[PDB]
Amino acid sequence: TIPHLAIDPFSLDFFDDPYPDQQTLRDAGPVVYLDKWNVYGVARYAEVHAVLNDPTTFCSSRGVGLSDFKKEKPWRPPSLILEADPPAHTRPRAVLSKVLSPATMKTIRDGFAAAADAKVDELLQRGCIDAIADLAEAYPLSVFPDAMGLKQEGREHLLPYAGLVFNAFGPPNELRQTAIERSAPHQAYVNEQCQRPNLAPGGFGACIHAFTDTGEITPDEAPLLVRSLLSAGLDTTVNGIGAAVYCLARFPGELQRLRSDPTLARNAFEEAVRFESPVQTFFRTTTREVELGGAVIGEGEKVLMFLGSANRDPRRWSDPDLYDITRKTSGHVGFGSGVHMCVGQLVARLEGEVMLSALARKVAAIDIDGPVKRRFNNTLRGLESLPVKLTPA
Ligand code: HEM
Ligand SMILES: COc1cccc(C(=O)O)c1
Ligand SMILES: [Cl-]
């Protein structure tokens, strides 16, 4: 009944160009079985959306990577939000939602915007830059660690730690095992910065620790909630902003539309998240026998959701392989969907909006002028190097 495929969605060949294999996964059927890793896969929008929105049947507390926490020990203590189910998920999720709230965005927006404008001005003085290291990495590094309340020393651990975390959702391939082999110094730094005395007053981390007296979380839960933000809050935005710049560099007609109406910046970033899907995949684990797309899946089975493929499913999207900054993007699953939908999405969208606004107002052209190099990760899609020439407006 269920088609069996030999595609490895975590192989370097797949990462290098995933779109043909993603169509093969979609067109084989609503539910496939991946013989390489003994998991079920869903690559169409409908089934990915359905799985995300049934957390009772497709749970997260047995891990959202390949490893099943009921069978193997997690490589680090489980996240209290990403790797939890309702009801244990509910109150930690509420705290992070209030920490990363609209009111918090109003407090930091002017600073985030000023830093975006300053970075673009700085880059325009150089002309020829690397849009990854000098922009997609440099800008989030210039705002997010400060907004967290982190000290200056040791920030070089943040991107390596996040790369490790996202590699660790993958299967035990060389990417994952090499990441874990090098993990010790990055885990040590991150776990230490999660303690209340090491988080500056007014930042996200101090606000988490201040929310430990309402009956929603206890003081011993705050370090792991800070860890969630230090795991998921930086590398994601790096690849999201990098995706947006890569899109504008490849689709100059859309850069010209953005320049003519800078208020399109927020949707231009949202469309980049759909188009590239920086977070490509997550797993769930079935808690019972379930019918999905006419197929019967037993209890305790891993289900791999192809978020990037769902975001390019022609059953759901018109011209899915086109970057369109005025597309109605509502419903894309690049931030997930349902009870686990990205709790930091307001931060991600704020960073992306103000950076694309700075580009819209200050830059006339973005031309690739060097070899493009891809960065390989079991969960994240993005570039290692994006040489571009920026022409001032
Ligand atoms: C372009 C940027 C980002 C993308 C594409 C992204 C993607 C996602 C996705 C797909 C999920 C759902 C995970 C699941 O269903 O299992 C998620 C959840 C989450 N994200 Fe984001 N994210 C981004 C930025 C951020 C930022 C800036 C933060 C923090 C400041 C953050 C923190 C989190 C956390 C803690 C969760 C877990 C939420 C929960 O389980 O309830 N992310 N993200
Ligand atoms: C996609 O959201 C993420 C990603 C990685 C880690 C976490 C966390 O809670 O530690 C969350
Ligand atoms: Cl850790």
XYZ file of C-alpha atoms and ligand atoms in Angstrom:
448
model
C 0.000 0.000 0.000
C 2.607 2.520 1.136
C 5.392 3.174 -1.400
C 8.913 2.464 -0.166
C 11.641 4.855 -1.302
C 15.422 4.722 -0.934
C 15.858 8.518 -0.935
C 18.054 9.740 1.912
C 16.738 13.224 2.822
C 19.820 13.733 5.027
C 22.455 12.996 2.364
C 24.711 15.720 0.996
C 23.386 15.082 -2.524
C 19.847 15.751 -1.272
C 20.905 18.946 0.528
C 22.704 20.151 -2.606
C 19.451 20.100 -4.602
C 16.401 18.793 -2.716
C 13.651 19.875 -5.099
C 13.540 16.907 -7.545
C 13.591 14.380 -4.698
C 10.933 16.403 -2.866
C 8.659 16.171 -5.908
C 9.333 12.429 -6.047
C 8.359 12.181 -2.368
C 5.165 14.187 -2.953
C 4.049 12.352 -6.088
C 4.740 8.841 -4.758
C 1.749 9.216 -2.432
C 0.399 11.094 0.591
C 2.431 8.823 2.914
C 5.744 7.170 2.033
C 8.129 4.866 3.872
C 11.830 5.781 3.841
C 13.738 2.486 3.924
C 17.051 4.241 4.627
C 15.978 5.243 8.146
C 12.799 3.184 8.812
C 10.490 6.198 9.159
C 7.279 7.327 7.540
C 7.400 10.505 5.481
C 4.851 13.126 4.490
C 5.860 15.701 1.885
C 2.572 17.239 0.699
C 1.122 20.336 2.335
C -2.105 18.621 3.416
C -0.497 15.779 5.387
C 2.252 17.960 6.879
C -0.403 20.415 8.067
C -2.562 17.579 9.425
C 0.323 15.998 11.345
C 1.404 19.334 12.851
C -2.153 20.007 14.041
C -2.730 16.643 15.779
C -0.146 16.737 18.595
C -2.007 14.040 20.546
C -1.473 11.389 17.871
C 1.818 12.835 16.553
C 3.635 13.785 19.747
C 6.882 15.678 20.364
C 7.889 14.353 23.807
C 9.533 11.296 22.230
C 11.776 13.695 20.285
C 11.388 15.725 17.091
C 14.540 14.215 15.620
C 15.050 10.681 14.365
C 15.919 9.331 17.814
C 12.981 8.032 19.862
C 13.427 9.123 23.486
C 11.540 6.000 24.592
C 14.314 3.888 23.004
C 17.453 6.060 23.295
C 18.763 8.637 25.732
C 18.523 12.222 24.417
C 21.912 13.736 23.626
C 21.021 16.611 25.996
C 18.220 17.067 28.554
C 14.941 17.505 26.661
C 13.706 20.967 25.806
C 10.813 21.937 28.061
C 8.911 23.350 25.084
C 10.047 21.856 21.754
C 10.268 18.317 23.169
C 7.179 18.450 25.407
C 3.497 17.724 24.817
C 0.390 19.352 26.268
C -0.244 19.813 29.114
C 3.410 19.996 30.260
C 4.161 22.119 27.184
C 1.432 24.659 27.883
C 2.713 26.870 30.682
C 6.381 27.019 29.555
C 5.051 27.964 26.118
C 2.942 30.732 27.674
C 5.972 32.187 29.471
C 8.099 32.322 26.319
C 5.140 33.872 24.485
C 4.936 36.679 27.053
C 8.722 37.135 27.085
C 8.784 37.456 23.272
C 5.599 39.512 23.265
C 4.356 42.432 21.164
C 5.268 44.740 24.053
C 8.816 43.386 24.015
C 8.999 43.946 20.249
C 7.903 47.551 20.759
C 10.761 48.021 23.241
C 13.479 46.714 20.893
C 12.226 47.642 17.402
C 13.958 51.019 17.101
C 17.273 49.504 18.178
C 16.943 46.542 15.820
C 16.064 48.913 12.964
C 18.950 51.295 13.695
C 21.376 48.355 13.703
C 20.011 47.106 10.368
C 20.410 50.520 8.731
C 23.924 50.893 10.156
C 24.992 47.469 8.880
C 23.788 48.175 5.334
C 25.526 51.562 5.381
C 28.705 49.828 6.561
C 28.439 47.148 3.866
C 27.863 49.740 1.133
C 31.218 51.326 2.013
C 32.875 47.988 1.190
C 30.764 47.291 -1.908
C 31.825 43.658 -2.340
C 30.879 41.599 0.723
C 29.886 38.096 1.795
C 26.137 38.227 2.408
C 26.426 35.339 4.881
C 29.314 36.245 7.201
C 29.000 40.015 6.738
C 25.191 40.308 6.754
C 23.114 37.206 7.510
C 25.426 36.319 10.404
C 26.755 39.753 11.372
C 23.389 41.486 11.774
C 21.691 38.915 14.086
C 24.942 38.668 16.050
C 24.805 42.454 16.488
C 21.282 42.516 18.015
C 20.211 39.131 19.363
C 22.929 38.317 21.960
C 22.445 41.814 23.391
C 18.654 41.414 23.439
C 19.202 38.134 25.308
C 21.369 39.875 27.900
C 24.520 37.855 27.211
C 27.979 39.040 28.158
C 30.432 39.818 25.373
C 32.891 37.006 26.098
C 32.203 33.638 24.506
C 29.614 34.653 21.905
C 31.653 32.722 19.318
C 30.064 29.580 20.826
C 26.510 30.520 19.822
C 26.477 29.598 16.133
C 28.485 26.359 16.656
C 26.114 25.311 19.445
C 23.048 25.995 17.305
C 24.547 24.114 14.364
C 25.124 21.167 16.702
C 21.539 21.260 18.010
C 20.033 21.266 14.528
C 22.420 18.566 13.295
C 21.390 16.442 16.298
C 17.780 16.186 15.105
C 19.121 14.203 12.158
C 19.949 10.537 11.825
C 23.252 9.205 13.174
C 25.167 10.147 10.030
C 28.605 11.764 9.892
C 27.162 15.282 10.209
C 25.468 14.383 13.488
C 28.237 12.341 15.064
C 30.927 14.884 14.180
C 28.795 17.655 15.696
C 28.336 15.738 18.945
C 32.062 14.891 19.047
C 32.888 18.623 19.182
C 29.982 19.644 21.416
C 31.582 19.785 24.877
C 32.934 23.391 24.907
C 29.800 24.835 23.288
C 27.395 23.082 25.673
C 29.469 24.249 28.649
C 29.323 27.911 27.633
C 25.615 27.832 26.763
C 24.499 26.016 29.912
C 26.473 28.516 32.010
C 24.927 31.592 30.353
C 21.476 30.187 31.203
C 21.942 30.900 34.925
C 20.173 33.987 36.282
C 23.291 35.951 37.423
C 24.771 35.760 33.898
C 21.835 37.449 32.117
C 21.767 41.237 31.964
C 18.762 43.112 33.399
C 15.977 43.782 30.918
C 16.953 41.123 28.369
C 15.053 38.020 27.311
C 16.969 35.762 29.689
C 16.393 37.907 32.768
C 12.711 38.156 31.853
C 12.416 34.359 31.751
C 13.954 34.107 35.223
C 11.612 36.855 36.455
C 8.580 34.799 35.320
C 9.392 31.991 37.793
C 6.940 33.090 40.513
C 3.539 33.087 38.755
C 2.769 29.371 38.996
C 3.613 28.839 35.323
C 7.279 27.861 35.703
C 9.565 27.271 38.653
C 13.105 28.674 39.040
C 14.681 25.334 38.064
C 12.883 25.456 34.688
C 14.191 28.891 33.677
C 17.735 27.802 32.619
C 16.370 25.308 30.082
C 13.944 27.920 28.722
C 16.858 30.320 28.226
C 18.608 27.391 26.535
C 15.686 27.118 24.108
C 16.240 30.714 22.985
C 20.014 30.259 22.713
C 19.423 27.088 20.683
C 16.730 28.305 18.282
C 16.929 32.098 18.236
C 20.092 32.896 16.254
C 21.005 30.348 13.563
C 17.397 30.250 12.339
C 17.343 34.007 11.702
C 20.786 33.805 10.080
C 19.436 31.362 7.503
C 16.162 33.265 7.171
C 17.879 36.562 6.405
C 20.394 34.742 4.212
C 17.485 33.169 2.338
C 15.913 36.588 1.749
C 19.135 38.110 0.410
C 19.746 35.049 -1.780
C 16.207 35.411 -3.165
C 16.638 39.121 -3.886
C 20.001 38.412 -5.542
C 18.458 35.753 -7.816
C 15.170 37.591 -8.564
C 16.194 41.196 -9.346
C 12.661 42.016 -10.488
C 11.491 41.440 -6.920
C 14.253 43.634 -5.490
C 13.015 46.383 -7.803
C 9.457 45.909 -6.534
C 10.703 46.001 -2.930
C 12.661 49.222 -3.545
C 9.529 50.861 -4.964
C 7.470 49.972 -1.861
C 9.590 49.307 1.247
C 6.417 48.425 3.181
C 6.618 45.074 1.355
C 9.673 44.200 3.479
C 7.786 42.080 6.020
C 6.023 39.971 3.387
C 9.199 39.767 1.294
C 10.854 38.140 4.308
C 7.854 35.879 4.926
C 7.974 34.749 1.298
C 11.688 33.974 1.658
C 10.889 31.761 4.653
C 8.360 29.858 2.538
C 10.617 29.759 -0.530
C 13.785 28.470 1.147
C 12.314 27.062 4.400
C 15.405 27.454 6.636
C 14.024 24.752 8.939
C 13.514 21.939 6.435
C 12.238 19.041 8.535
C 10.993 17.876 11.907
C 9.819 14.503 13.208
C 6.851 13.395 15.292
C 6.183 10.042 16.977
C 2.819 8.282 16.817
C 1.151 7.556 20.161
C -1.416 5.164 18.637
C -2.362 3.409 15.438
C -3.591 6.092 13.043
C -4.896 6.465 9.500
C -3.050 9.146 7.524
C -3.732 9.683 3.827
C -5.387 6.280 3.540
C -2.414 4.534 5.180
C -2.345 2.835 8.583
C 0.613 3.815 10.781
C 1.243 1.835 13.948
C 2.051 3.105 17.413
C 5.556 4.307 18.193
C 6.530 5.145 14.608
C 8.587 8.162 13.597
C 6.967 10.456 11.021
C 9.202 12.843 9.064
C 7.527 16.100 7.980
C 9.046 17.871 4.959
C 8.240 21.501 5.782
C 10.142 22.863 2.787
C 8.361 20.471 0.431
C 4.969 21.381 1.905
C 5.871 25.017 1.194
C 6.455 24.171 -2.494
C 3.537 21.759 -2.986
C 1.701 22.773 -6.200
C -1.449 21.225 -4.712
C -1.415 24.184 -2.283
C 0.600 26.946 -3.987
C 0.357 28.615 -7.377
C 3.789 28.816 -9.029
C 5.424 27.449 -5.851
C 8.952 27.708 -7.276
C 8.654 31.468 -7.888
C 9.738 34.075 -5.343
C 6.832 36.553 -5.139
C 6.991 39.258 -2.464
C 3.274 40.073 -2.804
C 2.181 36.423 -2.488
C -0.467 35.653 0.118
C 1.895 33.659 2.331
C -0.519 32.899 5.191
C -0.610 29.178 5.910
C 2.971 28.309 4.982
C 4.612 25.959 7.482
C 8.112 27.485 7.602
C 7.419 28.451 11.234
C 5.407 25.294 11.864
C 1.703 25.203 12.653
C -0.414 24.569 15.722
C 0.576 24.463 19.379
C 4.343 24.373 18.667
C 4.304 27.090 15.981
C 7.461 29.203 16.359
C 7.201 31.097 19.643
C 9.997 33.407 18.461
C 8.414 34.303 15.123
C 7.865 37.947 16.114
C 11.609 38.292 16.713
C 12.438 36.532 13.440
C 9.994 38.697 11.480
C 11.204 41.895 13.169
C 14.831 41.180 12.240
C 13.928 40.189 8.689
C 11.614 43.162 8.178
C 14.061 45.834 9.341
C 16.946 44.328 7.364
C 14.894 44.122 4.167
C 13.652 47.671 4.808
C 17.252 48.899 5.048
C 18.074 47.114 1.787
C 14.937 48.468 0.091
C 15.839 52.062 0.956
C 19.630 51.980 0.518
C 20.552 49.399 -2.161
C 19.922 49.615 -5.911
C 21.291 46.217 -6.970
C 22.509 42.944 -5.450
C 24.716 40.997 -7.870
C 26.329 37.653 -7.095
C 30.006 38.150 -7.915
C 31.682 35.006 -6.600
C 31.277 31.268 -6.027
C 28.222 30.406 -3.943
C 28.914 27.756 -1.290
C 26.189 25.802 0.499
C 26.234 24.968 4.214
C 25.177 21.405 5.053
C 23.104 20.620 8.150
C 20.684 17.809 8.964
C 17.863 20.305 9.662
C 18.848 23.775 8.386
C 19.018 24.845 4.740
C 21.286 27.780 3.991
C 24.491 29.038 2.450
C 28.046 29.099 3.761
C 29.161 31.936 1.476
C 27.239 34.356 -0.769
C 29.601 36.848 -2.454
C 27.622 39.863 -3.656
C 28.283 43.360 -4.931
C 25.930 45.934 -3.393
C 25.221 49.014 -5.508
C 24.010 52.061 -3.544
C 20.674 53.636 -4.428
C 13.472 32.456 10.259
C 13.549 32.165 11.567
C 12.878 30.941 12.245
C 12.325 29.839 11.692
C 12.228 29.457 10.197
C 11.825 28.999 12.764
C 11.193 27.777 12.625
C 10.513 27.108 13.628
C 9.636 25.964 13.467
C 9.300 25.272 12.129
C 9.170 25.611 14.674
C 8.192 24.446 14.961
C 8.907 23.264 15.603
C 7.980 22.080 15.735
O 6.813 22.152 15.260
O 8.416 21.051 16.317
C 9.739 26.524 15.651
C 9.535 26.515 17.016
C 10.272 27.231 17.937
N 11.073 28.331 17.673
Fe 11.417 29.107 15.817
N 12.083 29.643 13.958
C 12.722 30.836 13.684
C 13.141 31.766 14.616
C 13.116 31.622 15.989
C 13.537 32.607 16.966
C 14.095 33.993 16.575
C 13.366 32.076 18.197
C 13.646 32.692 19.593
C 14.003 33.965 19.807
C 12.817 30.744 18.019
C 12.483 29.841 19.012
C 11.632 28.763 18.861
C 11.163 27.873 19.910
C 11.539 27.971 21.405
C 10.350 26.963 19.360
C 9.606 25.826 20.101
C 8.139 26.253 20.219
C 7.270 25.158 20.788
O 7.688 23.970 20.773
O 6.153 25.478 21.282
N 12.676 30.509 16.666
N 10.552 27.419 14.977
C 12.774 24.938 16.162
O 12.763 25.313 17.511
C 13.840 24.823 18.258
C 15.007 24.398 17.627
C 16.075 23.918 18.373
C 15.976 23.872 19.757
C 14.816 24.303 20.388
C 14.713 24.246 21.911
O 13.612 24.463 22.484
O 15.735 23.970 22.593
C 13.745 24.779 19.641
Cl 23.400 21.337 25.634
